[PDB]
Amino acid sequence: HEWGKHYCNHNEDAGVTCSDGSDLELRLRGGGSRCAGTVEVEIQRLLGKVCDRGWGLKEADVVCRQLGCGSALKTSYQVYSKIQATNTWLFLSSCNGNETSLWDCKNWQWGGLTCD
Amino acid sequence: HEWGKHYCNHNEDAGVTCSDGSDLELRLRGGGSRCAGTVEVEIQRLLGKVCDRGWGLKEADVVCRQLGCGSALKTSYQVYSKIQATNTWLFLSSCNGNETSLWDCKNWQWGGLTCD
Amino acid sequence: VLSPADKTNVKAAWGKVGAHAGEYGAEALERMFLSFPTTKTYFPHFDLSHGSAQVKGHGKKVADALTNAVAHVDDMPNALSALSDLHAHKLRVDPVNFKLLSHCLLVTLAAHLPAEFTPAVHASLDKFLASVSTVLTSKYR
Amino acid sequence: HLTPEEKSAVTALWGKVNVDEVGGEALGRLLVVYPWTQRFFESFGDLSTPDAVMGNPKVKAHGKKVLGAFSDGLAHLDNLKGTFATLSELHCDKLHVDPENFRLLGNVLVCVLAHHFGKEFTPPVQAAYQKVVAGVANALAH
Amino acid sequence: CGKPKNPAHLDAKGSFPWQAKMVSHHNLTTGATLINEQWLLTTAKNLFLNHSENATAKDIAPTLTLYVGKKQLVEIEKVVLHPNYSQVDIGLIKLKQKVSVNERVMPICLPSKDYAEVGRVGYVSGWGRNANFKFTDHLKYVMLPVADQDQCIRHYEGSTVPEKKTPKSPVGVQPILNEHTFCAGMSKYQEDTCYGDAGSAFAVHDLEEDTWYATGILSFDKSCAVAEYGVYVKVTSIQDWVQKTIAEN
Numbered sequence: 033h034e035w036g037k038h039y040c041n042h043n044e045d046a047g048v049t050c051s052d053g054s055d056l057e058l059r060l061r062g063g064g065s066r067c068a069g070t071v072e073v074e075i076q077r078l079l080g081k082v083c084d085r086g087w088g089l090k091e092a093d094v095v096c097r098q099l100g101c102g103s104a105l106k107t108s109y110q111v112y113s114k115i116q117a118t119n120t121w122l123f124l125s126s127c128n129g130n131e132t133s134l135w136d137c138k139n140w141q142w143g144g145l146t147c148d
Numbered sequence: 149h150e151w152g153k154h155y156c157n158h159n160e161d162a163g164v165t166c167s168d169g170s171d172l173e174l175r176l177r178g179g180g181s182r183c184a185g186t187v188e189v190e191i192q193r194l195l196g197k198v199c200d201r202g203w204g205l206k207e208a209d210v211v212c213r214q215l216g217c218g219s220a221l222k223t224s225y226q227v228y229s230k231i232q233a234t235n236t237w238l239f240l241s242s243c244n245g246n247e248t249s250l251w252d253c254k255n256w257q258w259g260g261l262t263c264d
Numbered sequence: 265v266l267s268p269a270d271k272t273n274v275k276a277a278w279g280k281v282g283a284h285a286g287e288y289g290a291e292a293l294e295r296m297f298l299s300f301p302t303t304k305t306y307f308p309h310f311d312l313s314h315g316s317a318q319v320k321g322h323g324k325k326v327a328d329a330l331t332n333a334v335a336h337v338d339d340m341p342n343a344l345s346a347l348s349d350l351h352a353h354k355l356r357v358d359p360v361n362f363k364l365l366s367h368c369l370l371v372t373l374a375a376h377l378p379a380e381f382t383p384a385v386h387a388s389l390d391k392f393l394a395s396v397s398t399v400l401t402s403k404y405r
Numbered sequence: 406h407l408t409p410e411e412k413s414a415v416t417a418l419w420g421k422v423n424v425d426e427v428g429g430e431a432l433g434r435l436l437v438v439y440p441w442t443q444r445f446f447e448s449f450g451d452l453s454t455p456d457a458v459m460g461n462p463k464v465k466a467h468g469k470k471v472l473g474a475f476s477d478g479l480a481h482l483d484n485l486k487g488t489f490a491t492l493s494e495l496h497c498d499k500l501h502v503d504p505e506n507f508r509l510l511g512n513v514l515v516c517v518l519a520h521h522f523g524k525e526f527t528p529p530v531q532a533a534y535q536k537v538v539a540g541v542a543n544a545l546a547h
Numbered sequence: 548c549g550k551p552k553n554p555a556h557l558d559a560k561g562s563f564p565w566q567a568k569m570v571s572h573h574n575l576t577t578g579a580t581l582i583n584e585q586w587l588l589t590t591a592k593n594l595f596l597n598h599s600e601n602a603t604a605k606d607i608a609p610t611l612t613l614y615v616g617k618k619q620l621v622e623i624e625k626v627v628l629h630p631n632y633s634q635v636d637i638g639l640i641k642l643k644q645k646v647s648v649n650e651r652v653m654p655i656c657l658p659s660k661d662y663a664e665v666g667r668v669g670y671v672s673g674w675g676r677n678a679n680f681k682f683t684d685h686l687k688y689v690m691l692p693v694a695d696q697d698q699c700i701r702h703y704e705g706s707t708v709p710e711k712k713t714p715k716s717p718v719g720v721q722p723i724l725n726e727h728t729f730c731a732g733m734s735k736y737q738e739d740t741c742y743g744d745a746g747s748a749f750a751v752h753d754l755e756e757d758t759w760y761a762t763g764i765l766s767f768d769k770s771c772a773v774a775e776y777g778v779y780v781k782v783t784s785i786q787d788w789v790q791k792t793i794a795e796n
């Protein structure tokens with residue numbers, strides 16, 4: 033539309049992350065086994081978490097589908113605890129559930145906001 | 149305000165009651181002692197009663213402090229004797245709760261309005 | 265100002281409201297009281313409990329006043345002369361309350377007649393209620 | 406402040422709202438009822454007639470954004486003042502929207518919530534909704 | 548004369564210095580205009596508040612609190628009404644001490660030529676009521692086009708010939724209309740003055756001299772967009788008495 037004459041702010045600036053696809057890792061940590069726990073993301077040597085903004089079972093099926101586990105049932109744990117803490121987050125809007133990898137879901141954002 | 153140009157009807161006419169202060173006396177009647185009954189008022193040898201509107205233990209406390217008794221406990225009594233009828237009424241505003249006489253309460257009206 | 269189309273919209277809406285106007289007015293009074301307690305200062309001698317017949321009658325009176333105003337949309341100041349004098353000098357109701365009440369009344373309609381409360385009808389009812397409020401509060405002094 | 410009953414009622418009722426329609430409808434109602442507010446939204450093109458504003462996608466998108474802000478505020482009822490501080494600075498510095506227009510938005514928003522809920526908008530929960538819209542209006546003021 | 552800091556409903560941010568706020572002893576807000584270092588202009592109706600009109604101006608003067616600039620208090624010394632106040636609501640007020648003219652306090656000087664020509668666009672700023680009938684916290688300013696006098700007379704009184712006049716003001720109250728007045732219609736977005744903006748100047752920006760001139764003092768603020776015209780008193784018709792009063796004091 034125009035240069036500068038907008039009402040955005042510096043807490044909602046843009047950015048980009050690019051990769052060839054050989055270093056995108058997704059996993060679960062802090063649970064009974066590999067197929068349960070909190071979702072842990074790894075990209076280009078930095079590891080962070082995700083944010084509940086629509087984390088329904090239908091959207092959650094994709095994470096299980098990528099790792100070879102079955103479907104998604106609930107959002108909790110029973111066995112193990114005390115996972116590491118990182119101040120970086122990933123945001124996902126919506127996914128229809130039949131895409132085999134989380135990296136293919138529409139408009140997945142890596143970092144830039146804190147979901148308080 | 150403007151002379152003659154107002155909308156009050158003839159049921160809202162004002163009045164005044166001036167006294168030396170030695171001719172005002174209130175009693176409790178209908179109960180079992182000096183300190184239980186309906187609150188009867190004597191102002192210039194005219195009978196009367198106090199309106200329930202706005203009547204609470206905080207005002208009853210000053211009423212029973214002036215008569216020489218303790219703190220008020222209830223807004224009722226046992227009917228030891230019948231009480232005669234009267235026409236005038238005394239309307240009481242909020243009392244601060246520490247003055248030593250009902251006459252010291254701010255803006256108390258004698259007569260006029262009806263306790264319907 | 266109320267444009268002729270605006271008058272037609274107001275007339276149609278208040279025809280559609282029907283006999284439920286008294287109940288809607290009572291509900292609006294209660295809702296204004298509950299939302300903003302400060303507006304209860306002008307009803308010290310009023311039984312303001314749930315289901316009270318006093319506020320029901322008061323709401324019926326307000327609704328009848330507004331219906332009379334709609335019937336005389338072209339000569340509103342004369343229709344509300346007595347009420348204007350009552351609310352201006354006698355009771356000295358602040359202007360703010362009027363707008364408050366208007367909004368309350370409006371929401372009540374939206375709660376009960378969603379189908380007819382189109383944006384154009386919303387604008388028309390807002391303009392009419394603003395005109396009534398201005399007439400009643402004009403001589404405030 | 407909000408009593409636990411009011412908090413429960415307001416959260417439960419807000420759980421039943423839809424993002425993509427009610428906020429846009431509220432914004433369109435504000436544009437149509439108070440014309441002087443069009444000056445700020447001139448960027449959105451044609452706002453001359455009611456059907457135009459109701460039919461404008463940009464209005465619906467901005468309604469989505471303001472409703473998202475409202476949901477965030479609901480999630481931060483205790484700390485509304487700090488929750489909207491950035492938005493307060495934004496509207497105070499760059500736009501010069503008067504503090505009353507925020508309350509105007511709150512009243513139209515309450516109107517459309519009544520419009521959608523129907524009988525379910527009992528006066529007790531409307532009191533809480535009035536309190537929250539008042540809180541956000543005051544927080545955004547200055 | 549006539550140099551504001553910034554030439555420009557919309558919240559003012561450094562554009563209207565001449566404006567001044569007044570409150571009576573019973574908490575009603577009104578407006579006024581700075582005319583010189585020590586004199587103001589206001590409507591007479593803003594002086595007979597909460598008391599009978601039989602009282603003298605000496606009784607009026609100490610009961611009014613006056614703010615200028617950014618909530619800067621000033622004290623009133625004298626109040627002088629126009630001898631024919633029944634038909635022209637001009638009223639002048641004298642400050643206790645002449646103000647130090649600065650960016651937030653600066654007068655508006657008066658027309659040498661009439662500007663009330665139909666279609667002329669002027670500015671009106673005031674502390675009056677808002678859409679919710681609460682006094683505005685921040686100063687508000689609106690743009691109004693001058694309107695034909697005959698249409699205004701028809702709107703508020705029906706007919707121009709005195710014998711045939713009958714009251715038809717849509718807001719109940721009737722304004723004072725005569726040769727000493729002019730009227731203005733609503734803005735483009737249907738913005739109009741409401742309670743409390745009385746006394747505010749109708750400012751016209753003359754580009755030839757790059758100067759702001761106070762063309763009128765609002766004398767009817769009860770329109771509140773319900774009536775279609777607001778009523779002002781022409782400064783040119785009042786210039787001479789203003790000059791005489793200032794010179795005499």
Ligand code: HEM
Binds near residue numbers: 329396
């Ligand atoms: C659309 C706006 C309003 C309308 C049409 C309206 C109409 C009326 C009517 C018809 C009456 C009865 C007069 C009579 O019986 O002689 C009345 C009385 C009254 N109104 Fe209003 N009114 C409005 C706004 C308000 C507001 C905003 C308040 C206060 C916040 C208020 C407070 C009162 C009070 C205290 C009375 C006296 C009731 C009594 O003495 O029993 N009114 N009004």
Ligand code: HEM
Binds near residue numbers: 040470502506
């Ligand atoms: C009262 C509650 C309000 C909330 C929660 C709110 C929230 C927001 C938010 C989150 C934005 C950011 C949009 C973006 O970055 O693209 C925004 C922008 C904006 N707001 Fe508000 N706002 C409120 C009141 C108002 C009011 C009352 C007005 C005008 C009458 C207004 C006018 C605007 C405008 C013009 C923009 C910029 C739109 C653009 O140029 O793209 N806001 N608001």
Ligand SMILES: *[C@@H]1O[C@H](CO)[C@@H](O)[C@H](O)[C@H]1NC(C)=O
Binds near residue numbers: 630631788
């Ligand atoms: C007031 O009106 C009268 C009417 O006869 C006129 O003689 C007088 O000059 C007027 N005064 C002023 C100050 O305009």
